[PDB]
């Protein structure tokens, strides 16, 4: 009488008449609503999602009578039950249905039987944008709520007689309610409002009931704290919400992270929570993550902060610039020995390994404190594959390229020592290439500076990408050039031969500065093509460098963009948290930044150790 | 424009192609408003919500794999034009014996096939920006024609049909400060 | 230093063993050097529109 | 705290008994940073009305000078600075009322063409502290 497509057209019509009287019929064939044979074979999904799916005007009388039917039957405990075998919907129940379709009565009344508010949507479809799906809100019922604006529906969850949700509850992947919170707020104004007041609202409750450690606390599989994923994934507004939380009940203290630790006429001092922001190795610190590990396109914003930058500022006073001048101290005494020894070298024949002098002695220290410094920079280079390192460094100006640099300095001082070793004379040919790259690498130290104004407004990226251009156009043009050339009696003049492409160059380096010959004009067989190409060449020529000129023109004309100014801050800050990862932990715990303060009592008056960082302000507007 | 499914934080919606792109089929739409139409505002009508994601979509799919395909093997094709080491002594057809001479011999063929390949290209389009290509091609089968003739002024033309293949190679930044 | 107007003649470059990578470091020695020139001109002869014509008269009076 | 205290009022009514009245309400603060803060000013600092004019009511002192580091300009390395006078204190700190009371009181008044340690009179301090903001 009854099949499935009747039973699913019957109860999508929203029309409990024609469904009366199958009782009989399916209790003297002893079946049951949850049968193979009797739901989808493709969805596995029951009648009663359909009904949810299918609701109109926001109520349906048919989900009453069905729930009795499946009461009678002896099923509600597997009834209000779905795990879809889809690839698509591993998990979706109907409770999820419930709380998605927006309807407090059905969301009280599935759950008013207690059948379950912790079904876990793995489907493809509640997965992640990044990892291939729609949309994701974590994995329970209770995040479902809180992520679609449901607080009444939350409410319920919580204190309802049947059963309620535990909010430490962690989905497949480890997040919580408030990772999924912070998962799913893009930076509009319109979203982070409601995203910020449910998260401080579920932080409220979670701290009234079960009085322990907050649920800001709990970790993921990764042990990511909501903050530290909220910094990882480029979310500016609730990053900056939970920087500064505040709250005045007296029973929930603890959940603040910026206090009020004396207002002193109109000056105003503000006292920042510090215990995730700044750790000295034996944690994950947000600072770390929100410079290496971000979203790209708002890492700067996020940096603007009223902790961070003056943790910044703080951190350099006290050792980062007293280390980053030492370090470009010891690093142009480095070059200068270099250059010395560059200078100095002996030439003649074979490669100079007869010292036995003192000056030769003095010259053979200088070679070994280049090789180890390049050996240095090598295994500096190499060990960051077995830690933080692999991004799309290859022309990235967050010190992905200057590591690039410095990697090409290591490896190439390092074969100059093998050809130096080897016998092969070229070794001074690559030592020079070498010294010259490592001046130009002396850049690097630029970053702490803002004079400065116009050494910030040239940017040595642009400048090395025209240079390699350049010397590839001249290179290939040449190449073109000397083919024309008859062969074979001269070489370079007049004629062609297999080594006169290291001389012919010249002549264009000549002729381009303004004091070439014509000469070669008359050597080759074909001049109307090689005029022409010639022609053509210093077109190309001028019009590179003149385009190179107009780049650094409108680059240094405005004097301060809104990007560049941005991008020092973020070399500032790389350059601070390299010079402090490189220190050990004791060291990073006597230059730990902050004072350490009382900031309040909590339970069994237990005083609040938490490390803090004063930010006074002054402001003649508020009394 | 439809409304497939919506769910608060989510709202699917369904735009039509039936017009903006025919794949042979049909006259299309962008087509039109790239190449045969007012330029002076030829950028107002690419910021509509169809338009601009059926190209991002049409990237994601096979236009970034493309690309880097086409521009590798024409800078490959280009490194690869051998000018520099051709013969230089003896007569312009040089037989190849030696196993270092015919090594090279393979690269003059694949740049022949390259030139061929553009030659045909551009005439398929003749038949039913690219005037470059096809003086980029011409030039090719010339001076390989004149190499198996016996001219020996087949160098000074062979050179400049390839100078001017880096300056098509340009145009990949461009669409095949600023320059 | 003469390369830098141009006035000196340029036959150092034939004796250098190695002109491939001579020429190379002489070419971003001119492109270091133009640039390095050219900076410091447009930021002390160049440089608040008018702020310059107003406080330089007013200082003359 | 919530703008009164009763304990004030108790421990000025056993300081008179204690027979120390001019005395017991003066406060030389001999820390380095607070070199010359009173009760005077202290009070107007903090911006209540009935604790200074009951203090001043039986006129303890009005012309402390606050010559410590704190009270300093952030040239010399302080943090808030308006001069060393009570009366630059409270002008400064936006108190019309608290300088119109020390100034036609019955007990005594403070000179206000009296100089600060630095030769500056309150329009110098007020001058000092305005910054270029509308507020
Ligand atoms: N003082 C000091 C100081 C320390 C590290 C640093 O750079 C960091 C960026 N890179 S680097 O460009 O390759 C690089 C540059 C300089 C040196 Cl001496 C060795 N390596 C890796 C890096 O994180 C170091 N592990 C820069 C500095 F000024």
Redesign the interface.
Same mark, same amino acid.
């Given at each position: 009488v009854f099949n499935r497509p009747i039973l699913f057209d019957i109860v999508s019509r929203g029309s409990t008449a024609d469904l009366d009287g199958l009782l009989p019929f399916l209790l003297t064939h002893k079946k049951r609503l949850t049968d193979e044979e009797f739901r989808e074979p493709s969805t596995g999904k029951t009648c009663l999602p359909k009904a949810l799916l299918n609701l109109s005007n926001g109520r349906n009388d048919t989900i009453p009578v069905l729930l009795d039917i499946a009461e009678r039957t002896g099923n509600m405990r597997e009834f209000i039950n779905s795990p879809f075998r889809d690839i698509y919907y591993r998990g979706q129940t109907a409770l999820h249905i419930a709380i998605?379709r927006?309807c407090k009565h059905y969301v009280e009344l599935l759950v008013a039987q207690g059948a379950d508010v912790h079904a876990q949507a793995r489907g493809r479809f509640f997965q992640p944008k990044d990892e291939g799906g729609?949309?994701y809100f974590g994995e329970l019922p209770l995040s479902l709520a809180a992520?679609?604006?449901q607080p009444h529906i939350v409410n319920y969850l919580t204190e309802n007689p049947h059963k309620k949700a535990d909010m430490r509850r962690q989905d497949s992947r480890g997040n919580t309610v408030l990772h999924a919170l912070v998962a799913?707020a893009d930076n509009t104004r319109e979203?982070t409002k409601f995203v910020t007041k449910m998260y401080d609202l579920l932080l409220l409750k979670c701290a009234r009931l079960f009085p322990d450690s907050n649920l800001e606390a709990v970790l993921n599989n990764d042990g990511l704290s909501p903050l530290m994923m909220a910094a990882k994934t480029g979310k500016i507004g609730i990053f900056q919400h939970i920087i500064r939380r505040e709250v005045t009940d007296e029973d929930t203290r603890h959940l603040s992270r910026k206090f009020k630790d004396w207002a002193?006429?109109? +000056?105003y001092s503000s006292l920042y929570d510090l215990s995730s922001l700044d750790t000295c190795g034996e944690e994950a610190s947000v600072l770390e993550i929100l410079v290496y590990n971000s979203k790209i396109e708002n890492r700067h914003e996020m940096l603007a902060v009223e902790p961070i930058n003056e943790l910044l500022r703080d951190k350099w006073r006290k050792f980062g610039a007293v280390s980053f001048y030492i370090n470009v101290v010891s690093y142009l005494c480095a070059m200068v020995i270099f250059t010395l020894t560059a200078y100095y070298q002996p030439l003649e024949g074979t490669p100079p390994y007869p010292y036995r002098t003192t000056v030769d002695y003095l010259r053979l220290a200088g070679e070994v404190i280049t090789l180890f410094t390049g050996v240095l920079f090598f295994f500096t280079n190499i060990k960051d594959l077995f830690m933080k390192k692999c991004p799309g460094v290859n022309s990235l100006f967050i010190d992905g390229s200057f590591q690039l640099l410095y990697f090409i300095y290591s490896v190439l001082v390092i074969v100059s020592a093998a050809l130096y070793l080897a016998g092969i004379?070229?070794y001074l040919?690559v030592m +020079?290439?070498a010294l /010259?790259l490592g001046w130009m690498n002396a850049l690097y130290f630029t970053r702490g500076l803002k004079?400065s104004?116009?050494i910030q407004k @040239?940017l040595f990226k642009d400048?090395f990408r025209?240079?390699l251009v350049?010397?590839l156009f001249?290179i290939?043009?040449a =190449?073109?050039? +000397? =083919?024309?050339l008859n062969?074979?009696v001269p070489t370079y003049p007049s004629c062609?031969d297999?080594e006169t492409?290291?001389?012919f160059?010249?002549d264009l380096?000549?002729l381009t @500065? &303004?004091?070439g010959d014509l000469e070669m004009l008359s050597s080759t067989?074909?001049p109307? /093509?090689?005029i022409?190409?010639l022609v053509?060449y210093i077109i190309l020529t001028f +019009?590179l460098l003149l385009?190179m000129?107009?780049?650094?023109? &409108?680059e240094?004309?405005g004097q301060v963009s809104k990007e560049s100014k941005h991008i020092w801050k973020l070399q500032w800050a790389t350059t601070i948290l390299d010079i402090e990862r490189s220190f050990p932990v004791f060291l990073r715990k006597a230059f730990r930044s902050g004072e350490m303060v009382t900031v309040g009592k909590s339970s069994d008056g237990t005083p609040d150790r938490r490390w803090c960082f004063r930010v006074?302000e /002054?402001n003649? =507007?508020h009394?």
């Open positions: 998605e927006r729609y949309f992520c679609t604006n799913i979203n002193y006429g109109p +000056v004379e070229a040919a +020079v290439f /010259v004079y104004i116009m @040239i400048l025209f240079l350049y010397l001249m290939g043009y =190449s073109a050039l +000397v =083919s024309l062969p074979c062609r297999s492409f290291s001389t160059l010249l380096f000549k @500065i &303004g004091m067989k074909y109307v /093509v090689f022409i190409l053509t +019009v385009n000129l107009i780049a650094l023109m &409108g240094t004309v006074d /002054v003649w =507007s009394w």
